Amino acid sequence: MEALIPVINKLQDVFNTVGADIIQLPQIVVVGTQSSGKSSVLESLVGRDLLPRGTGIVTRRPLILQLVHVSQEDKRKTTGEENGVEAEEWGKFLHTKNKLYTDFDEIRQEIENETERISGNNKGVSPEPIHLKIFSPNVVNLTLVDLPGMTKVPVGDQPKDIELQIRELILRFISNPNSIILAVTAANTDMATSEALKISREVDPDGRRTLAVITKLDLMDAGTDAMDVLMGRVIPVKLGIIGVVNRSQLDINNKKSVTDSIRDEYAFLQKKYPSLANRNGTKYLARTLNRLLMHHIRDCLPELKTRINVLAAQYQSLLNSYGEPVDGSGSGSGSKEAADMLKALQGASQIIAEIRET
């Protein structure tokens, strides 16, 4: 049985600049607020810090993070750099094509380099995602669509008008019927007022497409345990409630080893939540997210295939409604879209046809 995650990864790449929304791809979309710790969740899954830091404003455009598992024997000759020590982990950006990044600091820098631009349109937020593959023996096969974080207070309770278009961007992504919403919220807050959960209920009223991740369990007030948060007595969400403890900024600056932060999280869970510890934590989260995505993709695969074909026939017949002038150039901008879309759909069906196992 062919692994389906790599297939959807390639489809994501195929529909990058051309418009992937109408495809309604099966994917996990990460919704979090400011100070929720969703960037840390991603880094917990990667096993490295790689996301741009901080201080402040930052991270406007979506990031499609594609974690690809490799064998520990599968390594890369690094850079040029006058060395040749074989590298165990590397990264690739779709914008830079086949270039290899063996230094995660150059990975973090390229993200900064691909973000924060004006981008030559008049906005503060761009809908165009960054595509980053991470090859590592320390990661599970998993892809996440990281969206720009919201303010932790309602949009009207803060002075920036731009927050609206941030909400629009998130809504645009999570309105995808085949998207799974990963809602990130800190245990440190009134969790039934999370902006992440609230905006998720706007497209998923009952939370049947939503999985809640509870971060910052180590930061709660004296003599609270969110056992209720562990229960999902309180949060109306169906795909699960998973509590984690990521590394703090203190830990990163101190260069806390990830092997040490992992067992520290585990030990914290064992102590504070003994009857629940086995269904919480970073490692657990990585495993159920992997299984969830695999099961979700195979569920959506048959409809995805026909939709690509249905879309193809529509765009082609639409090209015969536009349909001119037969000129080599200056044909149309709308005609150019449909042709570019048809080309991408062609690549999509090709990728899908290249699956075979029963």
Ligand X SMILES: Nc1nc2c(ncn2[C@@H]2O[C@H](COP(=O)(O)OP(=O)(O)NP(=O)(O)O)[C@@H](O)[C@H]2O)c(=O)[nH]1
Binding site membership for GTP: which residues? 32-40, 215-221, 246-249
**Residue placing its CB nearer to ligand X in the complex, 134 or 297:** 134
Do residues 244 and 44 make contact, with C-beta atoms less than 8 angstroms apart?
A: yes
Distance CA(185)–CA(193), nearest Å, equals 10
- 35 in contact with ligand X (CB under 6 A): yes
Coil, helix or strand at residue 175: coil
Shortest CB 253 distance to ligand X, Å: 9
**Residue placing its CB nearer to ligand X in the complex, 91 or 149:** 149
- 218 in contact with ligand X (CB under 6 A): yes
Which of residues 209, 216, 272, 307 is near ligand X by CB under 6 A?
216
Q: Could you tell me which stretch among 20-28, 74-82, 107-115, 213-221 binds ligand X (CB under 6 A)?
A: 213-221
Which of residues 12, 27, 36, 200 is near ligand X by CB under 6 A?
36
Query: Cα(first)–Cα(last) distance of the chain, in Å?
Result: 7
Distance CA(69)–CA(81), nearest Å, equals 26
Which of residues 9, 12, 27, 59 is near ligand X by CB under 6 A?
59
Residue 168: how many CB atoms within 10 A of its CB? 12
Q: Could you tell me which stretch among 38-46, 70-78, 112-120, 221-229 binds ligand X (CB under 6 A)?
A: 38-46
Coil, helix or strand at residue 210: strand
Tokens 């991603």, residue located = 42
Residue 325: is the preceding peptide bond cis (ω within 30°)?
A: yes
**Residue placing its CB nearer to ligand X in the complex, 33 or 143:** 33
Burial degree of 120 (CB within 10 A; 0-12, 13-18, 19+): exposed
Which of residues 17, 249, 254, 278 is near ligand X by CB under 6 A?
249
**Residue placing its CB nearer to ligand X in the complex, 59 or 210:** 59
Per the structure block, which two tokens stand in for 192? 């039934």
- Per-residue CA distances from 43 to 50, 51, 241 (Å): 7, 7, 19
Q: Which amino acid, residue 348?
A: A
Do residues 162 and 169 make contact, with C-beta atoms less than 8 angstroms apart?
A: no
**Site map 229..248 versus ligand X, x via CB under 6 A:** ----------------xx-x
- 40 in contact with ligand X (CB under 6 A): yes
Name the residue number minimizing CB distance to ligand X.
37
**Residue placing its CB nearer to ligand X in the complex, 9 or 215:** 215
- 25 in contact with ligand X (CB under 6 A): no
Shortest CB 41 distance to ligand X, Å: 7
Distance CA(244)–CA(280), nearest Å, equals 6
Eight-state DSSP code of residue 161: T
Q: Which residues fall within 8 angstroms of residue 124, CB to CB, at 6 or more apart?
A: 60, 162, 165
Shortest CB 74 distance to ligand X, Å: 30
- 62 in contact with ligand X (CB under 6 A): no
Per the structure block, which two tokens stand in for 164? 């609206």
Which of residues 26, 37, 62, 91 is near ligand X by CB under 6 A?
37
Do residues 172 and 21 make contact, with C-beta atoms less than 8 angstroms apart?
A: yes
Per the structure block, which two tokens stand in for 77? 């000759």
- 200 in contact with ligand X (CB under 6 A): no
Q: Could you tell me which stretch among 123-131, 191-199, 215-223, 225-233 binds ligand X (CB under 6 A)?
A: 215-223
**Residue placing its CB nearer to ligand X in the complex, 35 or 79:** 35
- 136 in contact with ligand X (CB under 6 A): no
Comparing C-alpha atoms, which of 20, 27, 2 is closest to residue 292? 27
Residues in contact with ligand X by CB under 6 A are: 32, 34-40, 54, 58-59, 149, 215-216, 218-219, 245-246, 248-249
